[PDB]
């Protein structure tokens, strides 16, 4: 049972989405960091819980979801049901973190990762304790209909490097991006 971690890829004009798809072309290496980051479970036999919004869920290739080696929860205020492939639903992030201690999900979950979007991010970011936001800084802005909210620097610190994260600017299919890590401990 654990760990609130926000993982996002943003363009430079901060968009995170366009027509319920991503603004940029698909970066398969961007995706693998995505995957490695959210799958790696740290104890000898539990799993990370992934919390994302229903759009975002839909947003993933029908055949990619549920995202395997991972319990996946959709934040859904409005529906009688965890969509097919979903493992759970909760009306709020907090009912999301309560199944942790729930007999429901107590002996299962290691790390908790917010996979999106903007508004579930927006809750997380504001929430107490220890948070870690992992951001892929896409270097060229694209047209987006959604944005990633604002990093209150009075609370987030840019960490100068982080074990398992490349510092170097990456570049795939013509797009430069850097992985940057932030963190707070209220």
Which phi and psi (to 5°) does residue 93 adopt? -55, -45
Three-state DSSP class for residue 117: coil
The answer to whether the annotation marks 16 as part of a ligand binding site is: yes
Structure token digits, residue 144: 């987006």
Burial class (CB in 10 A: 0-12, 13-18, 19+), 18: middle
Q: Return the CATH number at 4.
A: 3.40.430.10
Angle value at C-alpha 58, between 32 and 182, nearest 5 degrees: 45
Q: CA of 8: how far to CAs of 77, 80, 87, 103, in Å?
A: 22, 28, 22, 30
Expressed as residue numbers, the domain containing 15 is 1-186
Resolution (A): 2.2
Structure token digits, residue 121: 């991010």
The answer to whether the annotation marks 53 as part of a ligand binding site is: no
**C-alpha to C-alpha distance for 169 and 137, rounded to whole angstroms:** 9
In the chain the beta strands, taken as DSSP E runs, fall at 4-10, 15-17, 47-53, 71-75, 88-90, 109-116, 130-138, 146-147, 157-159, 170-172, 175-185
Elucidated via: X-ray
User: Half-sphere exposure (CA, 13 Å, Cβ side) for 6?
Assistant: 30
| Cβ pair 177, 170 in contact under 8 A | yes
Any idea which residues carry the catalytic annotation? 22, 30
The answer to whether the annotation marks 55 as part of a ligand binding site is: yes
**C-alpha to C-alpha distance for 103 and 173, rounded to whole angstroms:** 46
CA 102 to chain centre: 22
Count the domains in the chain.
1
Q: What is the dihedral sign for C-alpha 116, 12, 131, 179?
A: positive
The answer to whether the annotation marks 78 as part of a ligand binding site is: yes
């Amino acid at each position: 049972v654990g760990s609130l971690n926000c993982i996002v890829a943003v363009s430079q004009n901060m968009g995170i989405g366009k027509n319920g798809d991503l603004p940029w072309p698909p970066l398969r290496n961007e995706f693998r960091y995505f995957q490695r980051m959210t799958t790696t479970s740290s104890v000898e036999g539990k799993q990370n819980l992934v919390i994302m919004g229903k759009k975002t869920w839909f947003s993933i290739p029908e055949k990619n979801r549920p995202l395997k080696g991972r319990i996946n929860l959709v934040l859904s205020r409005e529906l009688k049901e965890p969509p097919q492939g979903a493992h759970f639903l909760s009306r709020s992030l907090d009912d999301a973190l309560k199944l942790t201690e729930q007999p429901e999900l107590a002996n299962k979950v290691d790390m908790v990762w917010i996979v999106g979007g903007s508004s579930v991010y927006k809750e997380a970011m504001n929430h107490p304790g220890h948070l870690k936001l992992f951001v892929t800084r896409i270097m060229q802005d694209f047209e987006s209909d959604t944005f990633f909210p604002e990093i209150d620097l009075e609370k987030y610190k840019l960490l100068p490097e982080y074990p398992g994260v490349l510092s170097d600017v990456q570049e795939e299919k013509g797009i430069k991006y850097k992985f940057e890590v932030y963190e707070k401990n209220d």
